[PDB]
Each structure stands twice: as structure tokens, then as C-alpha cells.
């Protein structure tokens, strides 16, 4: 009962999600910018990700549960593309915009205006990313992942493509991520 217990603090996916970077340990968060629980996890996870080793990385994907949500996915794509060393600031701004200020960032007309107004992160370069074909492609991939892997709740955190974190609370889930990262790192090396 110490450490990792399957069915208690993690479960194993029936179908693993391909990792973006081979030979590394991926921590993958599915989220939505509208989601109060995602907004609460965000500061905990972003703080924790600073402690990640050089072979670990945090990948994020916005769920797409309806056609209207592709706009938010394209925003998520644009942030990941161009926000660079201010991505944490960007995500924090966006979560607060949607969850606390009730800003309708799912409306492209509201979103583009709002991005152009950002300087705490580079709003204009993120807008450039939003307007580029790449963010459309990334949003479509997000939808494919949502549907293929039947992601039906947010936040969902998966380590090493195969281990789903079963959260008791956010802080304790960070310990689970660390234990899973070690499990993955050494499974992968042994293979």
C-alpha cells in the first residue's frame, strides 16, 4: 500500500497515448480553459513542473467535446506555439478570464481582440500563432486525441503515455506524478 497502487492512485490505460518525444518521460494533461478544477490544478502543476528533470516534459492538450470548443483548442495550440517563457502566465490569464471574469474566449472575435491586448505574455505573437495554419492543425489533433482515447473528464493527467493519475487532491497527485515518472523512466531504460 505504500507508493503506487493500481486502482487507487493510478490506473493503466487500455490504449496508450503515443508520446511526443521518444526516450523521455511525458506528463500529459488534458484540460479545458473553462474548467474550474483545471484552473485550480494549474498553479499546483505549473509549480511542480519546475522541478522536472531534463528528460521530463509537460505536454498539454485541450479537450474538444463539441465543434464550438475547437476555438479554445486553437487558443491552447497558439499558446503552446508562441507564448515561450511566459506560457504559465498565459494559461493563468486565460483560466482567470474564463472562470472568474466570464469572458467568452470561445468566440473568435472576442478572443482575437483579447489576445492583441496581452503583453505579460506576447499576445501579438500568440495571435500570429492563432492565425497560422499550424494552430488549426494542432486543434484538429486535439479533437482526434479526445475522441480516440475517450477523454471524458478534465483535468486528466497521464504519465508515460499509459499511467492515469487518480487524484485525491492536487498536491498529493504531484507525488504520484513523481512516482510514475520514475516507474516509466526505468521501465523504458530496461526495455
Automatic annotation (TrEMBL):
Keywords, comma-separated and alphabetical: Disulfide bond, Periplasm, Redox-active center, Signal
Disulfide bridges in this chain: 35-38, 35-38
Domain Thioredoxin: start-end pairs: 1-189
Cell compartment(s), UniProt: Periplasm
One GO cellular component term: periplasmic space
GO MF annotations in UniProt: disulfide oxidoreductase activity
Family stated for the protein in its record: Belongs to the thioredoxin family. DsbA subfamily.
Protein name in UniProt: Thiol:disulfide interchange protein DsbA
Species lineage: Bacteria, Pseudomonadati, Pseudomonadota, Betaproteobacteria, Neisseriales
Amino acid at each position: 500500500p505504500a507508493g503506487l497502487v493500481e486502482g487507487q492512485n493510478y490506473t493503466v490505460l487500455a490504449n496508450p497515448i503515443p508520446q511526443q518525444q521518444a526516450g523521455k518521460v511525458e506528463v500529459l494533461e488534458f484540460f479545458g480553459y473553462f474548467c474550474p478544477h483545471c484552473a485550480h490544478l494549474e498553479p499546483v502543476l505549473s509549480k511542480h513542473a519546475k522541478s522536472f528533470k531534463d528528460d521530463m516534459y509537460l505536454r498539454t492538450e485541450h479537450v474538444v467535446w463539441q465543434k464550438e470548443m475547437l476555438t479554445l483548442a486553437r487558443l491552447a495550440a497558439a499558446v503552446d506555439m508562441a507564448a515561450a517563457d511566459s506560457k504559465d502566465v498565459a494559461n493563468s490569464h486565460i483560466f482567470d478570464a474564463m472562470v472568474n471574469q466570464k469572458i467568452k474566449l470561445q468566440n473568435p472575435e472576442v478572443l482575437k481582440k483579447w489576445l492583441g491586448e496581452q503583453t505579460a505574455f506576447d499576445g501579438k505573437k500568440v495571435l500570429a500563432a492563432y492565425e497560422s495554419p499550424e494552430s488549426q492543425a494542432r486543434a484538429d489533433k486535439m479533437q482526434e486525441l479526445t475522441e480516440t482515447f475517450q477523454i471524458d473528464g478534465t483535468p486528466t493527467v497521464i504519465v508515460g503515455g499509459k499511467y492515469k493519475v487518480e487524484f485525491a487532491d492536487w498536491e498529493s497527485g504531484m507525488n504520484t506524478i513523481d512516482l510514475l515518472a520514475d516507474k516509466v523512466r526505468e521501465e523504458q531504460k530496461a526495455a
